[PDB]
From a paper:
Phage satellite P4 [name], [name], a building block of the viral capsid, inhibits hexameric transcription termination factor, ρ, by presently unknown mechanisms. The ρ hexamer adopts an NTPase-inactive, washer-like, open-ring conformation until NTPs (preferentially ATP) are engaged and RNA is bound at the SBS, leading to ring closure and RNA entrapment inside the ring. Our cryogenic electron microscopy structures of ρ-[name] complexes show that [name] dimers clamp two inactive, open ρ rings and promote their expansion to higher-oligomeric states. ATPase, nucleotide binding and nucleic acid binding studies revealed that [name] hinders ρ ring closure and traps nucleotides in their binding pockets on ρ.
In complex III, two hexameric ρ rings are bridged by six [name] dimers, that connect ρ(A) subunit 6 with ρ(B) subunit 1, ρ(A) subunit 5 with ρ(B) subunit 2, etc. Six [name] dimers bridge two open ρ hexamers, ρ(A) and ρ(B). ρ subunits are designated by increasing Arabic numerals from the centers to the peripheries of the complex. The different rotational orientations of the [name]-bridged ρ rings in complexes I, II, and III lead to different spacings between the innermost ρ subunits, which directly interact in complex I but are separated by a gap of ~ 30 Å and ~50 Å in complexes II and III, respectively. We further refined complex II (ATP; global resolution 3.8 Å), complex IIexpanded (ATP; global resolution 3.6 Å), complex III (ATPγS; global resolution 3.65 Å), and complex IIIexpanded (ATPγS; global resolution 4.25 Å). The ρ hexamers in complexes I, II and III exhibit slightly increased inter-subunit and ρ1-ρ6 rise values (8.4–8.8 Å and 42.2–43.9 Å, respectively). [name] interacts predominantly with one ρ CTD via the tip of its long coiled-coil (helices α1 and α2), the N-terminal part of helix α2 and the C-terminal helix α7. [name] helix α7 (residues 170–186) is placed in a cleft between the two neighboring ρ CTDs, covering the corresponding nucleotide-binding pocket. [name] R43 at the tip of the coiled-coil engages in cation-π interactions with Y197 of the main interacting ρ subunit. Finally, [name] P171, A172 and M175 (helix α7) engage in contacts with the T154-loop of the neighboring ρ subunit and cover the Watson-Crick side of the ATPγS base bound at that subunit, stabilizing it between ρ M186 and F355.
Numbering used by the authors:
A (entry chain f), B (entry chain e): 4 to 190
The structure:
C-alpha cells in the first residue's frame, strides 16, 4: 500500500513547493516596492536581498524534493503494474522467451546476465514496433486516478526552477543561513 | 516461411559440418596409420600434415557458420514469438507502462531515449523477479517442435572447436589452399 504514502508525500511536497514559491514572490514584490521608495533603507535593502536569495534556494530545494517524490511514485506505479501484468502473463511471456532464458536458474551469473540482456533488447525492438504502429493508450485502470492527479510529467515551473545546482559547500552555507533566518523570524 | 528457411539452412550447415569432421577424422586416422609405418614417405607426411591443417580450418569455418545460423534462427523465432505474444497482450502491457510512454512520437529524441531506457530497466526487474520465482519455462506451443530440433544451445563440439580465431591473412591463405586441394582432389 506504499503507493498511497508516495502519493500523499508527493502532494505535500507540491504544496510546500507552492508555498515557497508564493512566499518568495511576495518577498520580491515587497523588495521592489521598498527599493522604489525614496527611503534608502540600506540595511533593509540588503537584508531583503539575503531573504530573496535564501527563499529562492528554499524554492529550489522544494522543487527538487517534489521532482524526486514524483519520480518515486511513478517508479512504484510502474513496478507494481508490471508486477500484476507479469503475474498474469508470465508463462506466455517466458514461452515467448523460451529459446533465450530456458534453464535460467541452471546457469552462472554472467551467462544469466547475457541471457536476460538478449531477452530485454528483444523486448526493446518488440515494444518499438508496437508503439511504431501508432496507437494511443491511457493509464492503468486500477491506479488511473493517482497517476492522473500527479500528471504524466511534473510542472514546468518545478523543472526550470530546479535547473540550477549548488555545490555541497553552498548547500551547507545556505542551510545555515536558512536556519538562522528561521530562528530570527520565529522570535 | 522464413522460419522454415532458417531451420533447413541450419540443418544443411549442421550436415556440412558433420561431413567436415568426418573427413578430418579420417584424415588424421590415415595420417597416423602412415606415421606408424616404417616407410619414409616424407613428402606424403608433409602433404598429409597440410591436409590435416586445412581440414581443421574447414571444420572451424563450418562450425562457425552453423553457430551463426543457429543464432539467426533463434533470433527470428524470438522475434516472431514476442511479436505474437505482446501483440496479444499489449493493451495491458502499455497500460502498466503508461506513465512514461505518453506522447512518445511527439517527444524529442532524448526524451524518447530516456523513456525507452526506463521501460527497459522496468522490464529488466520484472523478468528477473519472475525468473527468481523459479518456475520452469517451456517452449511456445506453435513452434515447440522446431525449437526442440535446433535446441537451446548448439553442440559442445561447435563451441570448443571454434574457440581459436584466424587472422584474415591466414583466412585467405587457407581458403586458397582449400580451393587448390579441392581442385586437385576432383581430378
Amino acid at each position: 500500500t506504499a503507493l498511497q504514502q508516495a502519493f500523499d508525500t508527493c502532494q505535500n511536497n507540491k504544496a510546500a513547493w507552492l508555498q515557497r514559491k508564493n512566499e518568495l514572490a511576495a518577498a520580491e514584490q515587497e523588495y521592489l516596492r521598498l527599493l522604489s521608495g525614496e527611503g534608502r533603507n540600506v540595511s533593509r535593502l540588503d537584508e531583503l536581498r539575503n531573504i530573496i536569495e535564501v527563499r529562492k534556494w528554499q524554492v529550489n530545494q522544494a522543487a527538487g524534493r517534489y521532482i524526486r517524490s514524483h519520480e518515486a511514485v511513478q517508479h512504484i506505479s510502474i513496478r507494481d503494474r508490471l508486477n500484476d501484468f507479469m503475474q498474469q502473463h508470465g508463462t506466455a511471456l517466458a514461452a515467448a522467451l523460451a529459446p533465450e532464458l530456458m534453464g535460467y536458474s541452471e546457469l552462472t551469473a554472467i551467462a544469466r546476465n547475457c541471457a536476460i540482456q538478449r531477452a530485454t533488447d528483444a523486448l526493446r525492438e518488440a515494444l518499438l514496433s508496437w508503439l511504431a504502429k501508432g496507437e494511443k493508450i491511457n493509464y492503468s485502470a486500477q491506479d488511473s486516478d493517482i497517476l492522473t492527479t500527479i500528471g504524466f510529467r511534473p510542472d514546468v515551473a518545478s523543472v526550470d526552477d530546479s535547473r540550477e545546482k549548488f555545490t555541497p559547500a553552498q548547500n551547507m552555507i545556505f542551510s545555515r543561513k536558512s536556519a538562522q533566518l528561521a530562528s530570527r523570524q520565529s522570535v
